[PDB]
């Protein structure tokens, strides 16, 4: 009557190959709603699906806001109306992801790496909502993003090595949150520097494959530090 979990996962993999990320997100939402935990592979299919969907909406929103700002600094209400439509759709996708995280995926116990992964996702989608938010609502959204990232930070520090790619990615995104969203550039630079140095000190212990994965994210930290300093 319904579709098997394995078939939803297989079609999400096909949808990724066919670059049909809206379909991929729908298959992964269906697989999450089966109630079973996600594997490391399956967690990435969920994140890839929604990151691509919301990424396209974020990009469209920036284009429309850039046109709108230039139109003020061409005297029609259509630019504001259409930017508001894209904004509302983006918010709906973020609310869907955050709903999945809270109603199923995030648990009070279980695999630390998966919990960190999901709490980082929670911080990320509240950060995407903050990118388009204004006023007192923006203040609430920023607090929710910092809470999720901070909880993930606390768990990752006690449960994962400093070279873990998910720990590295979390710290990279939380430093971007500090720099771009919370207006805390000093904390952003401090965090990125600290994360890179702690990981560099431990790289000598890694296998060839682990070193490739960790150094891939360390290059993103290196890149932002260059940009910010």
């Amino acid at each position: 009557p319904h579709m098997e979990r394995a078939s939803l996962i297989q079609k999400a993999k096909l949808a990724e190959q066919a670059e049909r990320y809206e379909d991929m997100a729908a298959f992964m939402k269906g697989a999450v709603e089966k109630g079973e935990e996600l594997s490391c592979e399956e967690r990435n299919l969920l994140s890839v699906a929604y990151k691509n969907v919301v990424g396209g909406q974020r990009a469209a929103w920036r284009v429309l806001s850039s046109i709108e700002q230039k139109s003020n600094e061409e005297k029609g209400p259509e630019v504001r109306e259409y930017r508001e439509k894209v904004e509302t759709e983006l918010q709906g996708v973020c609310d869907t992801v955050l709903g999945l995280l809270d109603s199923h995926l995030i648990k009070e116990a279980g695999d630390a790496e998966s919990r960190v992964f999901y709490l980082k996702m929670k911080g990320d989608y509240y950060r995407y909502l903050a990118e388009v938010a204004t006023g007192d609502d923006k203040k609430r959204i920023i607090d929710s993003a910092r809470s999720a990232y901070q909880e993930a930070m606390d768990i990752s520090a006690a449960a994962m090595p400093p070279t873990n790619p998910i720990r590295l990615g979390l710290a990279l995104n939380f430093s971007v949150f500090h720099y771009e969203i919370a207006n805390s550039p000093e904390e952003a630079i401090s965090l990125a520097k600290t994360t890179f140095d702690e990981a560099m000190a431990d790289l000598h212990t890694l296998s060839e494959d682990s070193y490739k994965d960790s150094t891939l994210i360390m290059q993103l930290l290196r890149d932002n530090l260059t940009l910010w300093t």
Binding site: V48, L168, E180, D223, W228
Partner: peptide, 9 residues
């Protein structure tokens, strides 16, 4: 402009 982590890690 800066970068944030890839979707797949």
């Amino acid at each position: 402009s800066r970068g944030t982590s890839p979707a797949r890690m």
